[PDB]
């Protein structure tokens, strides 16, 4: 301290003691949803960029008329991450991980993961090396993180009822009668007397001749393709907060693919609704 | 107090159901499949117990 420092200084002599006065693998994610199976398909795609194209004839092989790279990949890893945790995710079909690649190549790996308001966090790692000269190799471990970001059930307008085919997709030989179990969910206030019917009449057309005849052929195939063996059925009662199965019976006469078949429409005898319940069907008769 | 990381289940879908609704003919016996996944990434479960308990 100041005392401990000034108590051992050297006083000036002859004076008083005191005084007073004074990048070649550009990659992309184009993930897409699939509400049918309830998944999201994330597909990475990495290709040799134009940088490699212009770099081929500069240092790699200037004197050769046409050269090409020897990109060898040792790891194409797709990983799902949340916080500190990470788990590898396998692809749909096999991908030989010690794969070779040359110039102007493009590769994709497709990954299926399950799908509201909880975006995922994914990481892609590409460990590879370009083989220049017979045995000289330079390793690269580029990687980066990102986030996975981007009908059969038919509802009734001006109501709360709900319709769904138990087996919305069925295939059967032509001329064999088949059965479809139409489920009805009713929870609004009260029962109903809805009646289901298939009309085998050609809807009048409203367009060039090509489009006009395409429309007529579509309507004809709809009209006289399938026949409902319980036409003008009376679904007896659907009490509130309860479900019911309408056991519909059909038989096909004209081979084709009746995806989202029209004509089958259910009439509600309370407000004259004409809901197109038949959109939840994918009949395929050979 | 701090506890370790825990998992979670999500209830993807049941096979022959529409938002957990069904009809029974009062005497017929049916069956269906329940699909779940452990959405956690760190650690897994080791003990499941299923105890159905209906309204009655």
Cβ-based neighbour number of residue A143 at 10 Å: 12
* Contact of A223 with A203, CB cutoff 8 Å: yes
* Contact of A258 with A283, CB cutoff 8 Å: yes
Residues in chain A: 286
- Dihedral (C-alpha) A66, A69, A70, A74: value to the nearest 10 degrees? -160
Residues of A with CB below 8 A from B9's CB? none
Cα A270 from chain centroid (whole Å): 40
- Supply the DSSP symbol for A55: H
Give the nearest partner residue to A243 out of B10, B23, B42, using CB atoms.
B23
Handedness of CA A172, A175, A177, A183 (dihedral sign): positive
Instruction: List, in sequence order, every residue forming a beta bridge with A143; answer none if it has no partner.
Output: A125
Cβ-based neighbour number of residue A72 at 10 Å: 14
* Contact of A32 with A40, CB cutoff 8 Å: yes
Q: Do B23 and A86 touch (CB under 8 A)?
A: no
Cβ-based neighbour number of residue A180 at 10 Å: 19
Would you state the structure tokens that stand for residue A227, as one six-digit string?
């026949």
**How far is CA A191 from each of CA A159, A195, B13, rounded to the nearest angstrom?**
12, 13, 28
Nearest alpha carbon to residue B13 among A209, A225, A260, A36:
A36
Bridging pattern class, strands A264-268 and A273-275: antiparallel
* Contact of A69 with A130, CB cutoff 8 Å: yes
Nearest CA in chain B to A186: B21
Q: Alpha-carbon distance A207 to A228, whole Å?
A: 32
Q: Alpha-carbon distance A234 to A196, whole Å?
A: 7
* Contact of A204 with A223, CB cutoff 8 Å: no
Residues of B with CB below 8 A from A165's CB? none
Cα A60 from chain centroid (whole Å): 40
Instruction: List, in sequence order, every residue forming a beta bridge with B9; answer none if it has no partner.
Output: B38
DSSP, collapsed to helix, strand or coil, labels residue A44 as strand
Would you state the structure tokens that stand for residue A251, as one six-digit string?
């038989």
Would you state the structure tokens that stand for residue A31, as one six-digit string?
């993930």
Cβ-based neighbour number of residue A185 at 10 Å: 19
Q: Longest C-alpha distance within chain B, in Å?
A: 52
∠ at Cα A163 (A193, A40), nearest 5°? 170
Q: Alpha-carbon distance B56 to B41, whole Å?
A: 38
DSSP string, A119-155: ---EEEEEEEEEEETTTEEEEEEEEEEE------SEE
For testing the chain B interface, which of A183, A242, A277, A280 should be mutated: the one with the most B CBs within 10 Å? A183
* Contact of A105 with A47, CB cutoff 8 Å: yes
Q: Do A82 and B22 touch (CB under 8 A)?
A: no
Would you state the structure tokens that stand for residue A186, as one six-digit string?
């009713």
Determination method here? cryo-EM
Provide the edge-to-edge strand list for the sheet that holds A256-259. A171-172, A282-285, A256-259
For B:7-26, CB contacts with A below 8 A are: 10, 12-13, 16, 18-19, 21-23
- Supply the DSSP symbol for A277: G
**How far is CA A64 from each of CA A50, A56, A57, A67, A253, rounded to the nearest angstrom?**
18, 10, 8, 6, 67
Cβ-based neighbour number of residue A162 at 10 Å: 18
Q: Alpha-carbon distance A147 to A81, whole Å?
A: 10
Bridging pattern class, strands A71-82 and A39-47: unpaired
For A215-237, b/e burial (b = at least 16 CB within 10 A) is eeeebebbbebbebeeeebebee
What resolution does the deposited structure have, in angstroms? 3.7
Q: Which residue has the tokens 């996944």?
A: B37
Residues of B with CB below 8 A from A38's CB? 12-13
Nearest alpha carbon to residue B44 among A52, A156, A87:
A87
∠ at Cα A235 (A231, A237), nearest 5°? 170
Q: Which residue has the tokens 């029962």?
A: A191
Q: Do A243 and B19 touch (CB under 8 A)?
A: no
DSSP, collapsed to helix, strand or coil, labels residue A225 as coil
Q: Alpha-carbon distance A248 to A283, whole Å?
A: 13
Q: Alpha-carbon distance A197 to A247, whole Å?
A: 13
Q: Is A200 on the interface with B (CB under 8 A)?
A: no
Q: Is B40 on the interface with A (CB under 8 A)?
A: yes
Bridging pattern class, strands A32-34 and A39-47: antiparallel
DSSP, collapsed to helix, strand or coil, labels residue A247 as strand
Cβ-based neighbour number of residue B30 at 10 Å: 9
Q: What are phi and psi of A181, to 5 degrees?
A: -100, 105
């Amino acid at each position: 301290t100041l005392d401990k420092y000034s108590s051992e200084e050297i006083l000036p002599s002859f004076e008083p003691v005191y005084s007073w006065s004074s990048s070649l693998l550009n990659m992309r994610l184009r993930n897409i949803s699939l509400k049918s199976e309830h998944c999201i398909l994330s597909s990475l795609d990495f290709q040799t960029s134009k940088a490699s194209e212009q770099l081929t004839k500069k240092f790699i092989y200037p004197q050769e008329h046409n050269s090409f790279l020897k990109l060898n990949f040792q790891e194409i890893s797709y990983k799902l991450i949340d916080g500190t945790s990470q788990i590898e995710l396998d692809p749909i079909c096999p991908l030989k991980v010690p794969l070779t690649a040359f110039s102007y190549d493009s590769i994709s790996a497709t990954f299926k993961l399950v799908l509201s308001t909880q975006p995922h966090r994914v990481k892609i790692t590409l460990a590879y090396e370009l083989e220049l000269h017979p045995n000289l190799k330079l390793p690269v471990r580029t990687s980066w993180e990102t986030e996975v970001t981007l009908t059969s059930l038919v509802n009734s307008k001006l109501s709360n009822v709900k319709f769904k085919f138990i087996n919305s997709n069925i295939k059967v030989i032509k001329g064999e009668k088949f059965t479809m179990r139409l489920q009805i969910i009713n929870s609004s206030s009260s029962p109903l007397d809805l009646v289901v019917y298939y009309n085998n009449t050609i809807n009048p057309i409203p367009l060039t001749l090509e489009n006009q005849y395409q429309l007529h052929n579509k309507y004809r195939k709809i009209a006289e393709g399938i026949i409902l063996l319980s036409n003008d059925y009376k679904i007896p009662v659907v009490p509130p907060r309860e479900t019911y199965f309408a056991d519909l019976r059909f038989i096909g006469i004209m081979s084709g693919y009746y995806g989202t078949l029209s004509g089958l429409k259910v009439l509600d005898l309370n407000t004259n609704e004409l809901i197109e319940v038949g959109n939840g069907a994918s009949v395929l008769i050979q | 107090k701090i506890l370790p990381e825990q998992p979670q289940l999500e209830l993807l879908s049941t096979s022959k159901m529409t938002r957990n609704s069904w009809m029974m003919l009062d005497g017929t016996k049916t069956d269906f499949h329940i699909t779940v996944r452990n959405k956690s990434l760190s650690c897994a479960i080791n003990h499941i117990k299923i105890i159905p308990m209906n309204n009655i």
